From a paper:
Voltage-gated K+ channels of the [name] family represent an important subfamily among the 70 different Kv channel genes in the human genome, with specialized biophysical properties to sustain high-frequency firing of action potentials. The combination of ultra-fast activation and deactivation kinetics and high activation potential of these channels are key for their ability to repolarize the membrane and terminate the action potential. Like other pore-forming subunits of Kv channels, [name] members are comprised of an N-terminal cytoplasmic T1 domain, which is involved but not required for Zn2+-mediated tetramerization, followed by the voltage-sensing domain (VSD) with transmembrane helices S1–S4 which is connected via a helical linker (S4/S5L) to the pore forming domain (PD) of the channel. Here, we present cryo-EM structures of the human [name].1a channel in an activated state, providing mechanistic insights into the modulation of [name] channels by the cytoplasmic T1 domain.
To elucidate the structural determinants underlying the biophysical properties of [name] channels, we purified the shorter α-isoform of [name].1 from mammalian cells and determined cryo-EM structures under different sample conditions (apo, Zn2+-containing vs. Zn2+-free). We achieved 3D reconstructions between 3.1 and 3.5 Å for the different conditions, which show only minor differences in the overall structure, and no clear densities for additional Zn2+ sites other than the known sites in the T1 domain16 (see Supplementary discussion). The polar head group of the lipid is stabilized by interactions with the imidazole group of H212 in the S1/S2 linker and backbone interactions with Q409 and M414 in S6. Our maps also show densities in the selectivity filter which likely correspond to K+ ions from the purification buffer.
Residue numbers in the entry:
A (entry chain C), B (entry chain D), C (entry chain B), D (entry chain A): 7 to 120, 169 to 223, 235 to 295, 299 to 464
The structure:
Amino acid sequence: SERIVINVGGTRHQTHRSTLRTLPGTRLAWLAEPDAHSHFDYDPRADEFFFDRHPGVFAHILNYYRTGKLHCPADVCGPLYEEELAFWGIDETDVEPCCWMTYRQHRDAEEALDWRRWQPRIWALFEDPYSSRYARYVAFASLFFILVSITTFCLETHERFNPIVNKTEYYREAETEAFLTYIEGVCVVWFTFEFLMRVIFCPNKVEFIKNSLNIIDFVAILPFYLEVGLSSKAAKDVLGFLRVVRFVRILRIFKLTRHFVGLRVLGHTLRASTNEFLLLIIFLALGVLIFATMIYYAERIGAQPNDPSASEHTHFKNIPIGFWWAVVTMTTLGYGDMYPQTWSGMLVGALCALAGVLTIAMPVPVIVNNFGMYYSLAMAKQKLPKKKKKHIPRPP
Amino acid sequence: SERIVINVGGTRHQTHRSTLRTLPGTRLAWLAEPDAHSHFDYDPRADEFFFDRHPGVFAHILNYYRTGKLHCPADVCGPLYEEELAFWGIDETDVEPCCWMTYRQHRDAEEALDWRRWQPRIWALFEDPYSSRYARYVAFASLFFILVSITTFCLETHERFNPIVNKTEYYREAETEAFLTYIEGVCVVWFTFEFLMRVIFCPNKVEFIKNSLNIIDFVAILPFYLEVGLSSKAAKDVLGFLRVVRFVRILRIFKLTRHFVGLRVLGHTLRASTNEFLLLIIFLALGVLIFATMIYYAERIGAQPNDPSASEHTHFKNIPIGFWWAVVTMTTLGYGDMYPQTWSGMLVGALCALAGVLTIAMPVPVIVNNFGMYYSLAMAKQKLPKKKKKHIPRPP
Amino acid sequence: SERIVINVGGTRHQTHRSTLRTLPGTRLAWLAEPDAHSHFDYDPRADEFFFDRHPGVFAHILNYYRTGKLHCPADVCGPLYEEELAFWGIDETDVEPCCWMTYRQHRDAEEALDWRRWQPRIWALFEDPYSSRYARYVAFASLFFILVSITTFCLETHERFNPIVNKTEYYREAETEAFLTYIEGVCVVWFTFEFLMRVIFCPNKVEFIKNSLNIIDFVAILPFYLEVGLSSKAAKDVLGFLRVVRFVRILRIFKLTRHFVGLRVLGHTLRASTNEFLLLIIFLALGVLIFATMIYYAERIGAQPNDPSASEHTHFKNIPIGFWWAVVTMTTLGYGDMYPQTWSGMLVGALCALAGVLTIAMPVPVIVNNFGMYYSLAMAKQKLPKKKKKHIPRPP
Amino acid sequence: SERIVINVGGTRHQTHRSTLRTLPGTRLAWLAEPDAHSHFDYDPRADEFFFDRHPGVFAHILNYYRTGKLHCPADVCGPLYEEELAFWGIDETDVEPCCWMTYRQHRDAEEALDWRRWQPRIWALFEDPYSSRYARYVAFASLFFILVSITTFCLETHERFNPIVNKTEYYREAETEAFLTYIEGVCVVWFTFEFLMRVIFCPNKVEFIKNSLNIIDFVAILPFYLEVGLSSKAAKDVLGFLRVVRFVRILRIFKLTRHFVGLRVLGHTLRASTNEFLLLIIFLALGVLIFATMIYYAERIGAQPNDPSASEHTHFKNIPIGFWWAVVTMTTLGYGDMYPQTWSGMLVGALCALAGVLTIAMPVPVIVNNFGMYYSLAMAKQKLPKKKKKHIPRPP
Ligand SMILES: [K+]
Ligand SMILES: [K+]
Ligand SMILES: [K+]
Ligand SMILES: [K+]
Ligand SMILES: [Zn+2]
Ligand SMILES: [Zn+2]
Ligand SMILES: [Zn+2]
Ligand SMILES: [Zn+2]
């Protein structure tokens, strides 16, 4: 009586019907019921129910039945154990929190990593470079032209290319060389050609507009074409903000680097580590505030009485200056523009440096481990072939 | 004779009665006794004792019986093995020290992470914000007002808001703008209202006073109300310390940040890593002392004989200055306010930098791993539901 | 019917013939075929096929048959599981990507770590030092002479050894002491003797010339012998580049350090971490470009209007200067030669420091783990004896 | 025929006699011999040999017999597997190098962590403090006096305590205050009393003299007693070196800190990581040399032709100065005393910073992991009780 032998994949597990009867509604519970001969596959010769499943984890499932706490067997990948407990009817939200973060690890990484006749050829200039030959050619050319645009920008901000002429009308200002403007015009011509080509075919235009890359491209090409458009009074304000917009022209490099792997992995890491980033920012804000206040008060202890101002010989004339020093000191950067100059200030400074090392090394390893797991997974999915589907599943 | 077969969860383990007889007092030992048929469940058909336990670890328990040294099977979470050896009667303080720190890991993290009718509504303003709607409103409002207080403080210490008027009576000093004092008064009104509301209901007033948060709040609200109270001779000394007390007014931010998770995890990490913090401080103190002495003596080797003082061209005029330089250099901060200027000094400086990297990277990874484990456990306990108790335990 | 029992190494596995029939062409599939009695070893007494293999992993192989996804059992080294699935006929390119990077780990490290009578004695001066006594003597002597050459170089570039004489013909320049030239001549004599000795025996001269070490040695000995060779007009240009060539004379130290272990491990690590190095360089290039642009624009917000130039009080007069500052700040180096001096600049600076910590700590741990695995493997292969071949394989 | 069933701890392993016959001389080989019934325990009823050993690893041992390569089962602590293969007769130097460094890990850490009536009371003042009450009192007192000595030293080197009097005979020099000399005398009296007490009982005087602590103590107490001893001509030279000896007086703090745990763990870590320290020093030496040469040559590219010296506007006037800069820059210290000032110099500087991060992060993690393992083991051995010997071994 009350002695039932479960045969899982050729391994016999024996236990009392009561242990099965503990957790109701599950398949093993239904085994415990007297109406079990018809319900499940069973042979009267050996009085054992036979299940064609992995036994090595059914050990742990039956253990959960026995003691009452479900654990993750640390010798199997999380998804395998997940699929087994899914078969057995066990809810996967019962595992102990001590063994949940390692269980839900592979699956976590997996989820985090996740006219008309010539239209295919039109769109083939925006598809992946390796997906064709025209695609790779257009990609190389757009790369060259983005780099030329960026170099034109960086050299336009230079002094050697911005001499000031003795021109009065009586204001004299630096002017840019004509060659820079001409190269900029050429690059604008090329980008406008590419943008019109992409606009030709825009399926699901809502998601096309939601695409940040196209937004950045259009915003980057917007200021130049405003040369013809430029009331002169509003025009000066819009030119003033137009320089600041032209600042975005360096963001066109992400269009090129999007096809890199490490950058997609970095995007997934960032989007998947919001909590740790907020944690790091909170830690840094508390540290900066506290240590700025402490150093501002410490450096006044040795202040000379003669001076009318509270602090004359110290860089820490107020607290916000303390914020700047505290960041520079906690990140172990240490420019040396401002540093403590009193024994009390030096004590506070050493404390700030150590606390900075600690509260920077708290969340950063979490973020780094996330990136490491996602990068390893992406490199795996890259090295392995796409799909072959060698397994031919049996009919139900 | 002396050949006994133990059936654990449907897996047969065979061994001689002597091996069981080694460790006395334990349940398996009692099995070895001839009065075992009545004592334990047993069938004469197969001459095997049947125990309804996980077999995969009973392997290791019987191995401890065989050889004499108990180890932790590295394929099961620590608590599972703990519970099994608890059932078998084995003392859990016998495992080898080589396998103790990994065994007692999940359990370690677990332990480290651990009138009257309107009184519930009164206290609901101090309860968690998400626990109600009034609670969340009061929390947002107290957040806004704490931030306004802190900004008032930081701007009061500024120069632009502390001009010195040409007022004599004949001493001229900077005075704060009236708007700052008025905003401070408003914030004091709000905090005093909140403090009276919390004082209304104070169960277990001993633990309420032992609560550091309420202490900080009351100490922070103490200086302002002393405006009316302010002998003028004692009053000047108490105002002088009152500024230093007002320095704590920034500590009211912990009241807000207490509901964050990362901060509670950080508190548990700190309170659980006292030994490693003391170790780090000892390492740094030895390093600082030794390297300060070494650099002070090194920089005098090349000292010019003409100068009457021992050191005129070196920043290292004595040893404590060496302490400051040694900290700044060992933490790789390197302000550049003081640095070696002699070949001997440069050798000592390079040694200090390397030794600093090493003796800072010794204990810090221990602390960081503690924080990582506790944070993963807290995030697990957050993601999983609270409790369902699906398991229905069998009657004893 | 359709119930087949596979006996692997004395452990019975039971499953239906359909599960075997899923994946065709494999050995277990052939078992499922009715012509299996003759094909494989089998006894009619127990109706079980017997395979003399490790059972602990055949569990996982049969599980792959059952569910359809192949995983790596995390309790066995990768090569053992590889060899088992090789025996069973399973393709090793089917394992899930979630468990591929840990599977292909030991094997990855393994692959990454991988006249005539007196000619043996001639070549024995270039063989390993420990491989003979003459070898060790010649190695010590060449070490002493390489070190003397390097010290001669470093002292020749010094000022104390380059006084300028009052010599006109009317140009006065610093000249090197005669002792330096004589020591250089002696070292050249020794290196030319060693080079002729090595040239005596040069098997597979194509690979001898492809050897970078011999290239470096010959290029290093080339400039001195050009003293006799030195048209005077071309001679001045070749001397000018000859100083730059003599710069390589410090590269002769790699000849000595090649016999060290850590350096060979470092070479394997570098050659095996090209992807992560390119990733790090891409991350740094994007960060440097973006933050240089941001700081250059930020520091102009507070620019004084009086000055004709856009920036007079800021170190960031253009963007490339921004590149230099951005590198120095992202690596937490922080010289202090140039730093932000405006509240906007300070915000951008703090962001640059944090982003630098993050995008430097992303790929560097990958590279460090590669080096750690390869170094542990090399130290293992060093500590273990070379080979004994105690196993005597059975005849097929 | 040739089918033998080994029963290990109640688990049947089946294999052919040939597989056992492969590796000769081992116990399983002797099983394969026809004279096996008498040699080993065996029952003719089941034709199985019974061994009372852990089966879970005998799987791997028999696998070594089968394939020919021995691996470490990653689910058991190294010592358990070691003891099993020791029983089976397998040599423990056969495991593959891929699985040797993790196998020999716990054992590695274990090895690395390893008149007359009143003489016990005499020596009880040098024994551990907690080992008695007199011991703890003497320890606290010696701690106070060592700290007083160290503070006296550090203040004696100060300026405020070394005024120069207007004393001629006509040389004026700073003199130390009398209170410092008196406190030094008191501390010398106490240390000499303690040293005589320890000298009273010195068993195995060779090892007592080999003890570095007693050496340091005696050398530290040597200079003061030379006050009476101080030819005046030799006396000045010995006083000059006596100041340098007195420099060691700070080394008396190790006597106190020896009873700390982290310091003993650090000593074991250092003594056990000689190879990685030499590796780090080699890496740093190569990096420093190469980058110093590179920066010295880079900074001359933009050198102004007017100046007679090769370099006037650069800090890098020669190569050794380059060594100093290269260390300060590779350790990310970055004082800012010397930095590149030419675009070529800036490129070399960025390369130096990155290469420094890499070649410092190569061996340091190895050293840190060693310290982590040893510290965890020491904390384990501290938390667990000393010894109980509950296991009563069976007679052979
Ligand atoms: K610095
Ligand atoms: K740093
Ligand atoms: K730094
Ligand atoms: K600096
Ligand atoms: Zn668990
Ligand atoms: Zn163990
Ligand atoms: Zn997997
Ligand atoms: Zn292995």
